[PDB]
């Protein structure tokens, strides 16, 4: 279960964050085969609660209500049809699985849901399910509120309610025997994988016993004998008490050490040096590199108050963002994926954006808007699409190309300009400090003269940007002007050109 189970050699998924399946099946189709992306991490496909104030936001989707297919993206049928156009050109795709809990104990009752269902979050009573008073944890908790109050106690994190959210007794047969249908039943429609929501908050024991529950992928267009691949939203920075390493041997656990050390890097904060990060990865205290999933941001902490607060960085700070994804994206280390957002408008208030519940670009009445693209390829009505950015996608095929090759020739100024290379297949350079970067160095790559997919591609037998010659000797000679705005620069063996 933490074999991501990719295909074609592609290395890397997106989180395209509230798109629609529509629009997700035609992005796959028009893009993310063509180029290269290993598949796709969708927002949770479950019915859930439609919260009315504040409107509608993005985080309604994390309340469900049933199992049933239809969610704020789509229907049950749109849904098929998207794992299927994705999967027939090889993008596999990882469901977002929020099972710790159903909606707020406070969500009322009525048919405000995804679905028009009923249901009484104030006796418990989910008909869809079914489920009911029964079926939830508040025996277990002993805290007033029934509420997690203090995360030093473990007990408190696993069966009191997450910010007053309806704790699932995940203990008892039957409420593991529903997850587990539920998560079989995506399973068979070619679902290749999940991103465990929630799961500090959920025990290893509950967890195990319903992934031991799950299928073998579907056949259609996985091997015989392929599992689900697993990974588990844990946030751990240290002094927690709860670490990944309880859960790391169940499946693959984010490592949100990376994004958050990876932000105060290139924002130089508290004397936070780029070339420190030589021994990046294991080096650093991360878990182990077969265990983890790393990113820059994801949808919590892209808004500026999750694991990393301030240091987090996002398509707000392009600059810096397109170094830290690159970064990221040349590194060897964690298995990687992509954050796509959508703007909204930021309202900070005592450095809090009162505004970050709000959800997708949508219509009035909520139902929310498709993905246009515009004819440069990037795309219109406040999505932002960092994954079509240049200096990302090609950093995304700069990965699969160097895939399994060792970190090697390491270089830094002592400061915050460095570079390194992954086996003899590629070679990367970054220049994040006050005055130019200007070096010879060993790239460990063949001579030739190989093309700076940062600013630009190989287009024919030429390159569209910038361009560079290493000698037969691999060294090369670099000039990174701190102006620049994107102040580094990467080639790789498909980048390079005919003799
Ligand atoms: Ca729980
Ligand atoms: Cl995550």
């Given at each position: 279960?933490?074999?991501?189970?990719?295909?074609?050699?592609?290395?890397?998924?997106?989180?395209?964050?509230?798109?629609?399946?529509a629009?997700?099946?035609?992005?796959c189709?028009?893009?993310?085969?063509?180029?290269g992306?290993?598949?796709?991490?969708?927002?949770?496909?479950?019915?859930?609660?439609?919260?009315?104030?504040?409107?509608?936001?993005?985080?309604?989707?994390?309340?469900?209500?049933?199992?049933?297919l239809c969610?704020?993206?789509?229907?049950?049928?749109?849904?098929?049809?998207?794992?299927?156009?994705c999967?027939?050109?090889g993008?596999?795709?990882?469901?977002?699985?929020?099972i710790?809990?159903?909606?707020?104990?406070?969500?009322?009752?009525g048919?405000?849901?995804?679905?028009?269902?009923?249901?009484?979050?104030?006796?418990?009573?989910?008909?869809?399910?079914?489920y009911?008073?029964?079926?939830?944890?508040?025996?277990?908790?002993?805290?007033?509120?029934?509420?997690?109050?203090?995360?030093?106690?473990?007990?408190?994190?696993?069966?009191?309610?997450?910010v007053?959210?309806?704790?699932?007794?995940?203990?008892?047969?039957?409420?593991?025997?529903?997850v587990?249908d539920?998560?079989?039943?995506?399973?068979?429609?070619?679902?290749?994988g999940?991103?465990?929501?929630?799961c500090?908050?959920?025990?290893?024991?509950?967890?195990?016993?319903?992934?031991?529950?799950?299928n073998?992928?579907?056949?259609?267009?996985?091997?015989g004998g392929?599992?689900?691949?697993?990974?588990?939203?844990?946030?751990?920075?240290?002094?927690?008490?709860i670490?990944?390493?309880?859960?790391?041997?169940?499946?693959?656990?984010?490592?949100?050490?990376?994004?958050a050390?990876?932000?105060?890097?290139?924002?130089?904060?508290n004397?936070?040096?780029?070339?420190?990060?030589?021994?990046?990865?294991?080096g650093?205290?991360?878990?182990?590199?077969?265990?983890?999933?790393?990113?820059?941001?994801?949808?919590?902490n892209?808004?500026?108050?999750g694991?990393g607060?301030?240091?987090?960085?996002?398509?707000?700070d392009?600059?810096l963002?397109?170094?830290?994804?690159?970064?990221?994206?040349?590194?060897?280390?964690g298995?990687?994926?992509?954050?796509?957002?959508?703007?909204?408008?930021?309202?900070?208030?005592?450095?809090?954006?009162?505004?970050?519940?709000?959800?997708?670009?949508?219509?009035?009445?909520?139902?929310?808007?498709?993905?246009?693209?515009?004819?440069?390829?990037?795309?219109?009505?406040?999505?932002?699409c960092?994954?079509?950015?240049?200096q990302?996608?090609?950093?995304?095929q700069?990965?699969?190309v160097?895939?399994?090759?060792?970190?090697?020739?390491?270089?830094?100024?002592?400061?915050?300009?460095?570079?390194?290379?992954?086996?003899?297949?590629?070679?990367?350079?970054?220049?994040?400090?006050?005055?130019?970067?200007?070096?010879?160095?060993?790239?460990?790559?063949?001579?030739?003269?190989?093309?700076?997919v940062?600013?630009?591609?190989?287009?024919?037998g030429?390159?569209?940007?910038?361009?560079?010659?290493?000698?037969?000797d691999?060294?090369?000679?670099?000039?990174?002007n701190?102006?620049?705005?994107?102040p580094?620069?990467?080639?790789?063996?498909?980048?390079?050109?005919?003799?």
């Amino acid at each position: 279960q933490h074999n991501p189970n990719t295909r074609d050699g592609r290395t890397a998924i997106v989180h395209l964050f509230e798109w629609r399946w529509a629009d997700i099946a035609a992005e796959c189709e028009r893009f993310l085969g063509p180029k290269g992306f290993a598949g796709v991490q969708i927002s949770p496909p479950n019915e859930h609660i439609l919260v009315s104030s504040p409107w509608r936001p993005w985080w309604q989707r994390y309340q469900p209500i049933s199992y049933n297919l239809c969610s704020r993206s789509g229907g049950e049928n749109e849904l098929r049809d998207m794992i299927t156009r994705c999967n027939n050109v090889g993008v596999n795709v990882y469901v977002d699985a929020v099972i710790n809990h159903m909606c707020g104990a406070g969500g009322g009752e009525g048919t405000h849901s995804s679905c028009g269902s009923w249901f009484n979050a104030n006796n418990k009573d989910f008909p869809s399910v079914p489920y009911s008073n029964l079926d939830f944890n508040d025996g277990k908790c002993k805290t007033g509120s029934g509420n997690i109050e203090n995360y030093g106690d473990p007990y408190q994190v696993r069966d009191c309610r997450l910010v007053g959210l309806l704790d699932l007794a995940l203990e008892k047969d039957y409420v593991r025997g529903k997850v587990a249908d539920f998560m079989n039943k995506l399973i068979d429609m070619g679902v290749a994988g999940f991103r465990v929501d929630a799961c500090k908050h959920m025990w290893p024991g509950d967890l195990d016993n319903v992934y031991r529950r799950l299928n073998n992928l579907n056949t259609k267009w996985f091997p015989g004998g392929s599992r689900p691949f697993i990974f588990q939203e844990v946030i751990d920075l240290g002094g927690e008490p709860i670490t990944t390493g309880e859960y790391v041997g169940l499946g693959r656990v984010t490592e949100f050490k990376y994004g958050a050390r990876l932000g105060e890097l290139f924002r130089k904060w508290n004397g936070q040096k780029l070339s420190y990060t030589k021994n990046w990865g294991e080096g650093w205290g991360f878990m182990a590199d077969g265990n983890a999933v790393v990113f820059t941001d994801n949808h919590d902490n892209q808004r500026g108050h999750g694991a990393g607060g301030a240091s987090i960085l996002t398509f707000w700070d392009p600059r810096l963002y397109k170094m830290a994804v690159g970064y990221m994206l040349a590194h060897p280390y964690g298995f990687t994926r992509v954050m796509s957002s959508y703007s909204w408008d930021r309202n900070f208030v005592n450095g809090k954006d009162e505004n970050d519940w709000i959800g997708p670009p949508s219509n009035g009445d909520g139902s929310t808007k498709p993905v246009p693209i515009n004819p440069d390829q990037t795309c219109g009505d406040g999505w932002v699409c960092e994954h079509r950015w240049r200096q990302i996608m090609n950093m995304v095929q700069f990965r699969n190309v160097v895939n399994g090759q060792p970190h090697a020739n390491w270089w830094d100024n002592g400061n915050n300009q460095v570079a390194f290379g992954r086996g003899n297949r590629g070679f990367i350079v970054f220049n994040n400090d006050d005055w130019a970067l200007d070096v010879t160095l060993n790239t460990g790559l063949p001579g030739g003269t190989y093309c700076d997919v940062i600013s630009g591609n190989k287009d024919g037998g030429s390159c569209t940007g910038k361009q560079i010659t290493v000698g037969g000797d691999g060294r090369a000679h670099f000039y990174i002007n701190n102006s620049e705005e994107d102040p580094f620069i990467a080639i790789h063996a498909d980048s390079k050109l005919h003799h």
